[PDB]
Amino acid sequence: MNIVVLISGNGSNLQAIIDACKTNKIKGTVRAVFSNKADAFGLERARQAGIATHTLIASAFDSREAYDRELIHEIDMYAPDVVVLAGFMRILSPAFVSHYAGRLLNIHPSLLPKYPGLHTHRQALENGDEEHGTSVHFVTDELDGGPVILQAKVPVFAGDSEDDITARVQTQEHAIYPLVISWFADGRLKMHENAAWLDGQRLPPQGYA
Amino acid sequence: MNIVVLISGNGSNLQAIIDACKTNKIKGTVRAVFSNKADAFGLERARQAGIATHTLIASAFDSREAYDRELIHEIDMYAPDVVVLAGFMRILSPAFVSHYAGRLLNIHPSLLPKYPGLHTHRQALENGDEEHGTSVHFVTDELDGGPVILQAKVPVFAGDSEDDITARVQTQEHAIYPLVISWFADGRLKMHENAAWLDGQRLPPQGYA
Ligand SMILES: Nc1nc(O)c2cc(C[C@@H](C(=O)O)c3ccc(C(=O)N[C@@H](CCC(=O)O)C(=O)O)cc3)ccc2n1
Ligand SMILES: Nc1nc(O)c2cc(C[C@@H](C(=O)O)c3ccc(C(=O)N[C@@H](CCC(=O)O)C(=O)O)cc3)ccc2n1
Ligand SMILES: NCC(=O)N[C@@H]1O[C@H](COP(=O)([O-])[O-])[C@@H](O)[C@H]1O
Ligand SMILES: NCC(=O)N[C@@H]1O[C@H](COP(=O)([O-])[O-])[C@@H](O)[C@H]1O
């Protein structure tokens, strides 16, 4: 089972995935890690693990379509069974989403449908929500509109800073992402009729309950 | 629980609603029926049931805003708890949608998002669909774009005419519309964050599953 991970920054989720393959919780391997930022430390995590790395700078391309195309061309050298977005700060084109339909995953730092887009933690905290979390879902063209597979809620108390809750959510992300990937790896997770299905059963709008 | 129905034609769905209130499946009453067509037989259905009727002709108004305004003014004489569109062939203005936000329902003759608008049936046959149906949803300014509450699928077999399928879908409509209205009447159905919620639970893009 070949996994290709796409990142943009630190890559703590990438690390959790790497560790899960190592323990075999995930019966597969991370074949490659792609980044749109040359600096991303995640690349360094993959490097140290003997995993291949690649970098595609948006400037070197003259259109989003041209960029994803070279991305698809590159990612495919590894014959991935699933493409995983772990902190990938770049929106993917419909062509790309199409090419990996049903096998493209992402983990959004909020309790979807709440706060699609960037700056989740802040909004959650500035709006005064008593509950925050993360959501792993199948990627569709709609910015975080795809079928939610699993969420991990996290209590929000007075006094918690933006970083406090962020580190709290992160701890959950490291738990549910590798898990969702393992479900996928065992052919227990699929998507059709734009819905997410676990063990053959339809999952609710907010993921496995 | 006061219900105000808006129609344009025969009113078979109106009748199903009327019958459901009679049996108390819906714990409420159709207080009035409005139509934008003087001929609509639905008016006679209501008439025979001892229900009040009203007609508002578009020609008698010089703008859509003026028309809905008078519509709101009239509908409100009946202090409705919910306004139900049953075959109403007229697009309502934002102000109107706003005034009945969360308490305005419609039943579209197709499996939304597929075939928003008119000519559902014909497109289904034409586009060679193996499945057709109806969708009850909360009304928002987006033409059949609001939160779908419940759909009723219907199989399509070679040999089926546009009338064969239409009559098949109608039969379903008479079943799910009164049902959805009862959910609403029991305070079990609500809309917030532009989503449909049944028994406190968020419903999928396709309605209750
Ligand atoms: N088609 C598609 N659908 C999704 O749901 C995607 C989901 C993701 C991750 C997502 C996160 O979980 O939240 C996410 C959502 C939004 C942006 C963004 O706007 N980034 C750029 C803007 C556009 C770009 O440069 O790509 C910025 O600098 O603000 C970056 C990641 C990435 C690509 C996606 N692509
Ligand atoms: N604001 C609003 N939003 C919706 O979603 C509505 C949904 C409905 C029913 C709908 C059905 O599901 O099918 C529906 C779909 C299309 C037309 C239409 O084009 N009507 C006019 C156009 C303009 C007018 O009303 O004068 C015509 O003569 O084609 C009328 C109702 C009626 C009014 C609505 N109003
Ligand atoms: N564009 C994707 C996105 O929203 N990523 C989010 O940014 C953080 C980076 O974690 P990381 O250590 O896994 O890189 C994670 O919390 C992840 O959900
Ligand atoms: N614009 C509304 C609309 O498309 N309504 C649809 O027209 C038919 C009329 O039924 P009826 O008059 O016998 O209830 C119904 O099938 C309804 O879904």
Curated annotation (Swiss-Prot), chain B:
Enzyme Commission number: 2.1.2.2
Enzyme class: transferase
Effect the entry attributes to changing D144 to A/E/S/Y: Reduces activity about 1000-fold
Keywords: Purine biosynthesis, Transferase
PROSITE patterns reported in the protein's UniProt record: GART
UniProt keyword Transferase present: yes
Effect of D144 to C/F/H/K/L/N/P/Q/R/T/V: Loss of activity
Pathway annotation: Purine metabolism; IMP biosynthesis via de novo pathway; N(2)-formyl-N(1)-(5-phospho-D-ribosyl)glycinamide from N(1)-(5-phospho-D-ribosyl)glycinamide (10-formyl THF route): step 1/1
Active site (UniProt): H108
Molecular function per GO: phosphoribosylglycinamide formyltransferase activity
GO cellular component: cytoplasm; cytosol
Catalytic activity: N(1)-(5-phospho-beta-D-ribosyl)glycinamide + (6R)-10-formyltetrahydrofolate = N(2)-formyl-N(1)-(5-phospho-beta-D-ribosyl)glycinamide + (6S)-5,6,7,8-tetrahydrofolate + H(+)
Activity regulation statement: Inhibited by N10-(bromoacetyl)-5,8-dideazafolate.
Effect of H108 to E/S/T: Reduces activity about 1000-fold
A GO biological process held by the record: DNA damage response
Function: Catalyzes the transfer of a formyl group from 10-formyltetrahydrofolate to 5-phospho-ribosyl-glycinamide (GAR), producing 5-phospho-ribosyl-N-formylglycinamide (FGAR) and tetrahydrofolate.
Assigned protein family: Belongs to the GART family.
Stored NCBIfam families: PurN (TIGR00639)
Protein name: Phosphoribosylglycinamide formyltransferase
Species name: Escherichia coli (strain K12)
